[PDB]
């Protein structure tokens, strides 16, 4: 009746018409309402093929995402590739949306809700949906933030294990709180971020075993990232339209795997020069804000990058990635594959 | 016209240390990561790192090379660079940069693709101890042990010079046919060496004078070998 | 992680016929992951083939690669006269590390040739300034393998010495090599009987070019 095919999409969103955060101005404009009856069918004995690594829908989100950003985002000052462009740089209201991905006439999303699927091969229990759920743009690296958990145990994603040059995406099964602070007032720009230490070892001692799970009992080891941009090398995100950069080396301590229940305060830094994950060059933007900037996160996803040459070795090394954001999309888009009628 | 640029050759000391630049034009910088390979004398080419310049440019180095080498990039400027440290007799070679996909993009009719497709012109690194020295050149007499039935084989040693590369002619250009220039060898002095050997009628090593010329641009060293038979 | 291997070390055909080269897959990687690639010298590698049977533009339609995960092949529908190079194929995603295969190249084919093989004594000039260099000169031969061994009263040397291989002439599809035994002054003088022996595919048996100091 069906088979697979790619079509362009159209997304869906409750932005109210008289807000000034920009999420909501920009899905005004971009996006229809919500379906207020959203319907989904289940299909008896049917068994689907999916592949959340090779999946259009995650290239046509990170398209809406950079048309997002180019309207609320503008820097005072963009570098990029021998074009200097100043410009002014208002202070906005910048708090993600759910966006919802729907399919056109013709064609329809077939849904994976296998509680065990890792993002690949064969799905069991399959629906038919003509949106997916929403799904906030929240642009950040290391930590997947605020996205949803996994139903049953911790699920490793991943489209080749075995090749060290592809991501893997770790998707929890229970949020750990993240709070972080500029507290209100010598600089400005000194930050940090509170995490329940006692929930958080508990919770990545999981994923080790998980982990282990895939790599034949072998020792898992956590290492700071080796190189990059700061907003790789430490866990980059946005809050209150303030780009924030958080050192998280006590966030992967291999010795809490004992003072290791106390609360993690991990140092960060709001930056006004920022490396534009678009990865289009460098942007600048004014001075942080007065008052306290505060933003509280669930932490649903880790992004990880495994060292290769551990063939011989009776250890496995892990590092945080990564600066591709098609990869936080796909964290959410992973059960989802369109097909036409 | 997609185009990659490197900067020029360089040679280094034992124990220095070398940075290649690479500027990008013609195209998208920051939708292609970039690769580092090398290619020396006799040998394939090693693949030495890639840069991820379009995703946080965090950069993956050659499990030979980790802890000498290391690579970044600048966007803005759309430059890539590689530096290698402690440079030995064995990193002496044409370094490469190129672009490549590398699965990140599904571009128009490929998909998903892997494959560097765009190279820089390359450049020469050369690790050597020693400095510019003109060639001492010896000729290569022809005689009974360099004649067999009516054709005689003669030449010219041009041996102990820095750095590449030396020209050689025979008879200022009027002499080509059966002429054999060979690849220079980097001997274990640090010193180029080659010989170019010609193959000539047997009767006439009695009438025609037969000389080699050597031009050496690095050192501004000419020399002209009258070979005789011994 | 992959070891590539490359079948033959020389592949020898002539021109307008068809070509087939083999790369091996130790691991066996994705088929988006073998590449294949042709250099010539003084160029940088210019990309045949990727994701194992794909095109870029402007590669010629008689370059076609095919592969299983762990086989592949390079097929040259047509040999070119600008098709003989040295060919690479190489793992372009499933590394880290990239590698290479060792290479295959691809050379004119002829008639064997036996080379003519010259010997070459020191100079007075060279001696005097306390190295020698004896030359030992394969010209004009077919095909490439050729084995050159140096003796010195009736010594087999080994590490004293250094070829060097012009490329394949265009007209008679020949090679040409040169063997450099280099020794200090002093033993130079110390021993009489240097040889030059050579094996070759057009010799009966090995040739000897011989003289005495
Ligand atoms: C978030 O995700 C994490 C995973 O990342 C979850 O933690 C996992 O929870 C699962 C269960 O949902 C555990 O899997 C089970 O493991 C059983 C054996 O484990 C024992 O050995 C391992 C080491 O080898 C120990 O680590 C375990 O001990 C620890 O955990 C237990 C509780 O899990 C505690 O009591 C201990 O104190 C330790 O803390 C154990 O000693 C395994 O038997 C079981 O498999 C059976 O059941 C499953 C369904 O659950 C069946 O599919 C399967 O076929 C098995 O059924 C067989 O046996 C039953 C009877 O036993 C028969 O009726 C059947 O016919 C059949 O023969 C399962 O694999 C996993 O170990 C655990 N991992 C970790 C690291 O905690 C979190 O719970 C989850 N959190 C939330 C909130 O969702
Ligand atoms: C992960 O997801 C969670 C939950 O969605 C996010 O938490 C939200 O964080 C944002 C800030 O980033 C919070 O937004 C704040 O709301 C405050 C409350 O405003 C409401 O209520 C007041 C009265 O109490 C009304 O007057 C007002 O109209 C609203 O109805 C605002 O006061 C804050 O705005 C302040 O600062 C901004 C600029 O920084 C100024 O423009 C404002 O004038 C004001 O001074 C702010 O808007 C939001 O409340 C949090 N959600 C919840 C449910 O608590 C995380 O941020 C998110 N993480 C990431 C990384 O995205
Ligand atoms: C995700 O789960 C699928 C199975 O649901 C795994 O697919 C298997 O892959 C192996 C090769 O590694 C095949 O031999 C099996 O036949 C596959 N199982 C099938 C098709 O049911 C896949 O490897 C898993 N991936 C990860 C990252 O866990
Ligand atoms: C199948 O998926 C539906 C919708 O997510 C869910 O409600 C149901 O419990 C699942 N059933 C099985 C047997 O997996
Ligand atoms: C955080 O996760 C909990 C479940 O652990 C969920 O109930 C809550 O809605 C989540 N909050 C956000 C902002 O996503
Ligand atoms: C976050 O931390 C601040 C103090 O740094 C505290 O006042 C606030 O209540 C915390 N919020 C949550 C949700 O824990
Ligand atoms: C992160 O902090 C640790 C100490 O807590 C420090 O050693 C490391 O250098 C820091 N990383 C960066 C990128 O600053
Ligand atoms: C890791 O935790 C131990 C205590 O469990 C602490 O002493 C050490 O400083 C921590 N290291 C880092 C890098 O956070
Ligand atoms: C994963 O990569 C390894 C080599 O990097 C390869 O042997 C294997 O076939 C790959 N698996 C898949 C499913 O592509």
């Given at each position: 009746?069906?088979?697979?095919?790619?079509?362009?999409?159209?997304?869906?969103?409750?932005?109210?018409?008289h807000?000034?955060?920009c999420?909501?101005?920009?899905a005004?404009?971009?996006?229809?309402?919500?379906?207020?009856?959203?319907?989904?069918?289940?299909?008896?004995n049917?068994?689907?093929?999916?592949?959340?690594?090779?999946?259009?829908?995650?290239?046509?989100?990170?398209?809406?995402?950079?048309?997002?950003?180019?309207?609320?985002?503008?820097?005072?000052?963009?570098?990029?590739?021998?074009?200097?462009?100043?410009?002014a740089?208002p202070?906005?209201s910048?708090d993600?949306?759910?966006?919802?991905?729907?399919?056109?006439?013709?064609?329809?999303?077939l849904?994976?809700?296998?509680?065990?699927?890792?993002?690949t091969?064969?799905?069991?229990?399959?629906?038919?949906?003509?949106?997916?759920?929403?799904?906030?743009?929240?642009?950040?690296?290391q930590?997947?933030?605020?996205?949803s958990?996994?139903?049953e145990?911790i699920?490793?994603?991943?489209?080749?294990?075995?090749n060290?040059?592809?991501?893997?995406?770790?998707?929890?099964n229970?949020?750990?709180?993240?709070?972080?602070?500029?507290?209100?007032?010598?600089?400005i720009?000194?930050?940090?971020?509170?995490?329940?230490?006692?929930?958080?070892?508990?919770?990545?001692?999981?994923?080790?075993?998980?982990?282990?799970?895939?790599?034949?009992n072998?020792?898992?080891?956590?290492?700071?990232?080796?190189?990059?941009?700061?907003?790789?090398t430490?866990?980059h995100?946005?809050?209150?339209?303030?780009?924030?950069?958080?050192?998280?080396?006590?966030?992967?301590?291999?010795?809490?795997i004992?003072?290791?229940?106390?609360?993690?305060?991990?140092?960060?830094?709001?930056?006004?020069?920022?490396?534009?994950?678009?990865?289009?060059?460098?942007?600048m933007?004014?001075?942080p804000?007065?008052?306290?900037?505060?933003?509280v996160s669930?932490?649903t996803?880790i992004?990880?990058?495994?060292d290769?040459?551990?063939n011989?070795?009776?250890?496995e090394?892990?590092?945080?990635?990564?600066?591709?954001?098609?990869?936080?999309?796909?964290?959410?888009?992973?059960?989802?594959?369109?097909?036409?009628? | 016209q997609?185009?990659?640029?490197?900067?020029?050759?360089?040679?280094?000391?034992?124990?220095?240390?070398?940075?290649?630049?690479?500027?990008?034009?013609?195209?998208?910088?920051?939708?292609?990561?970039?690769?580092?390979?090398?290619?020396?004398?006799?040998?394939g080419?090693?693949?030495?790192?890639?840069?991820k310049?379009?995703?946080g440019?965090?950069?993956?180095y050659?499990?030979?090379?980790?802890?000498r080498?290391?690579?970044?990039?600048?966007?803005?400027?759309?430059?890539?660079?590689?530096?290698?440290?402690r440079?030995?007799?064995?990193?002496?070679a044409?370094?490469?940069?190129?672009?490549?996909?590398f699965?990140?993009?599904?571009?128009?009719?490929?998909?998903?693709?892997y494959?560097?497709?765009?190279?820089?012109?390359?450049?020469?690194?050369?690790?050597?101890?020693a400095?510019?020295?003109?060639?001492?050149?010896?000729?290569?007499?022809?005689?009974?042990?360099?004649?067999?039935?009516?054709?005689?084989?003669?030449?010219?040693?041009?041996?102990?010079?820095?750095p590449?590369?030396?020209?050689?002619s025979?008879?200022?250009?009027?002499?080509?046919?059966g002429?054999?220039?060979?690849?220079?060898?980097?001997?274990?002095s640090?010193?180029?060496?080659?010989?170019?050997?010609?193959?000539?009628?047997?009767?006439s090593?009695?009438?025609?004078?037969?000389?080699?010329?050597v031009?050496?641009?690095?050192?501004?060293?000419?020399?002209?070998?009258?070979?005789?038979?011994? | 992680?992959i070891?590539?291997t490359?079948?033959?070390?020389?592949?020898?055909?002539?021109?307008?016929?068809?070509?087939?080269?083999?790369?091996?897959?130790?691991?066996?990687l994705?088929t988006?992951?073998?590449?294949?690639?042709?250099?010539?010298?003084?160029?940088?590698?210019?990309?045949?083939?990727?994701?194992?049977?794909?095109?870029?533009?402007?590669?010629?339609?008689?370059?076609?690669?095919?592969?299983s995960?762990?086989?592949?092949?390079?097929?040259?529908?047509?040999?070119?006269?600008?098709?003989?190079?040295?060919?690479?194929?190489?793992?372009?995603?499933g590394?880290?590390?990239?590698?290479?295969?060792?290479?295959?190249?691809?050379?004119?084919?002829?008639?064997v040739?036996?080379?003519?093989?010259?010997?070459?004594?020191?100079s007075?000039?060279?001696?005097?300034?306390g190295?020698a260099?004896?030359?030992?000169?394969?010209?004009?031969?077919?095909p490439?393998?050729?084995?050159?061994?140096?003796?010195?009263?009736?010594?087999?040397?080994?590490?004293?010495?250094?070829e060097?291989?012009?490329?394949?002439?265009?007209?008679?599809?020949?090679?040409?090599?040169?063997?450099?035994?280099?020794?200090?002054?002093?033993?130079?003088?110390?021993?009489?009987?240097?040889?030059?022996?050579?094996?070759?595919?057009?010799l009966?048996?090995?040739?000897?070019?011989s003289?005495?100091?």
């Amino acid at each position: 009746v069906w088979k697979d095919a790619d079509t362009t999409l159209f997304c869906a969103s409750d932005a109210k018409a008289h807000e000034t955060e920009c999420h909501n101005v920009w899905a005004t404009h971009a996006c229809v309402p919500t379906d207020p009856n959203p319907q989904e069918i289940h299909l008896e004995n049917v068994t689907e093929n999916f592949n959340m690594w090779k999946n259009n829908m995650v290239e046509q989100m990170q398209e809406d995402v950079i048309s997002l950003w180019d309207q609320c985002l503008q820097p005072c000052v963009k570098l990029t590739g021998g074009s200097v462009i100043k410009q002014a740089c208002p202070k906005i209201s910048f708090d993600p949306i759910p966006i919802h991905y729907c399919t056109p006439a013709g064609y329809v999303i077939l849904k994976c809700n296998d509680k065990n699927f890792n993002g690949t091969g064969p799905c069991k229990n399959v629906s038919s949906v003509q949106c997916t759920h929403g799904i906030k743009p929240v642009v950040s690296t290391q930590l997947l933030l605020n996205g949803s958990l996994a139903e049953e145990e911790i699920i490793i994603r991943s489209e080749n294990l075995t090749n060290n040059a592809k991501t893997i995406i770790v998707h929890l099964n229970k949020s750990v709180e993240i709070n972080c602070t500029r507290p209100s007032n010598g600089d400005i720009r000194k930050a940090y971020c509170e995490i329940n230490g006692t929930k958080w070892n508990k919770v990545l001692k999981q994923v080790t075993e998980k982990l282990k799970e895939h790599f034949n009992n072998k020792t898992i080891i956590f290492q700071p990232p080796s190189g990059g941009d700061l907003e790789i090398t430490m866990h980059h995100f946005n809050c209150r339209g303030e780009f924030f950069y958080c050192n998280t080396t006590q966030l992967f301590n291999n010795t809490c795997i004992k003072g290791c229940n106390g609360t993690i305060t991990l140092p960060c830094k709001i930056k006004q020069i920022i490396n534009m994950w678009q990865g289009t060059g460098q942007a600048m933007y004014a001075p942080p804000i007065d008052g306290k900037i505060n933003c509280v996160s669930n932490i649903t996803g880790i992004l990880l990058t495994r060292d290769g040459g551990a063939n011989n070795t009776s250890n496995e090394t892990f590092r945080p990635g990564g600066g591709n954001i098609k990869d936080n999309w796909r964290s959410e888009l992973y059960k989802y594959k369109v097909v036409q009628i | 016209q997609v185009r990659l640029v490197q900067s020029g050759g360089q040679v280094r000391k034992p124990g220095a240390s070398v940075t290649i630049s690479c500027e990008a034009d013609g195209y998208e910088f920051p939708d292609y990561y970039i690769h580092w390979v090398r290619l020396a004398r006799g040998r394939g080419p090693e693949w030495l790192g890639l840069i991820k310049v379009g995703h946080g440019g965090g950069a993956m180095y050659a499990p030979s090379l980790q802890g000498r080498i290391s690579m970044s990039r600048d966007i803005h400027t759309t430059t890539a660079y590689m530096t290698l440290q402690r440079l030995t007799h064995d990193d002496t070679a044409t370094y490469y940069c190129s672009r490549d996909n590398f699965g990140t993009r599904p571009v128009p009719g490929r998909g998903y693709y892997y494959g560097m497709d765009v190279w820089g012109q390359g450049t020469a690194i050369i690790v050597s101890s020693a400095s510019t020295k003109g060639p001492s050149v010896f000729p290569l007499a022809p005689s009974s042990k360099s004649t067999s039935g009516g054709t005689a084989a003669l030449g010219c040693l041009v041996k102990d010079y820095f750095p590449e590369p030396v020209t050689v002619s025979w008879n200022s250009g009027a002499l080509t046919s059966g002429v054999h220039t060979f690849p220079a060898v980097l001997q274990s002095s640090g010193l180029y060496s080659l010989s170019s050997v010609v193959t000539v009628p047997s009767s006439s090593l009695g009438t025609q004078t037969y000389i080699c010329n050597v031009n050496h641009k690095p050192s501004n060293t000419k020399v002209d070998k009258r070979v005789e038979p011994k | 992680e992959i070891v590539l291997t490359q079948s033959p070390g020389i592949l020898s055909l002539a021109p307008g016929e068809r070509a087939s080269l083999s790369c091996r897959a130790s691991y066996g990687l994705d088929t988006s992951h073998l590449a294949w690639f042709q250099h010539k010298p003084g160029r940088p590698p210019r990309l045949l083939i990727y994701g194992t049977s794909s095109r870029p533009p402007g590669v010629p339609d008689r370059f076609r690669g095919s592969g299983s995960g762990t086989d592949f092949t390079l097929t040259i529908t047509k040999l070119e006269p600008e098709d003989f190079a040295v060919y690479y194929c190489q793992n372009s995603g499933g590394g880290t590390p990239l590698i290479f295969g060792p290479g295959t190249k691809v050379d004119i084919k002829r008639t064997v040739a036996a080379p003519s093989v010259f010997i070459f004594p020191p100079s007075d000039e060279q001696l005097k300034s306390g190295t020698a260099s004896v030359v030992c000169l394969l010209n004009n031969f077919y095909p490439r393998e050729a084995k050159v061994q140096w003796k010195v009263d009736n010594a087999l040397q080994s590490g004293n010495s250094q070829e060097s291989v012009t490329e394949q002439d265009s007209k008679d599809s020949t090679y040409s090599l040169s063997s450099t035994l280099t020794l200090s002054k002093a033993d130079y003088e110390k021993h009489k009987v240097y040889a030059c022996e050579v094996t070759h595919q057009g010799l009966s048996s090995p040739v000897t070019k011989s003289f005495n100091r």
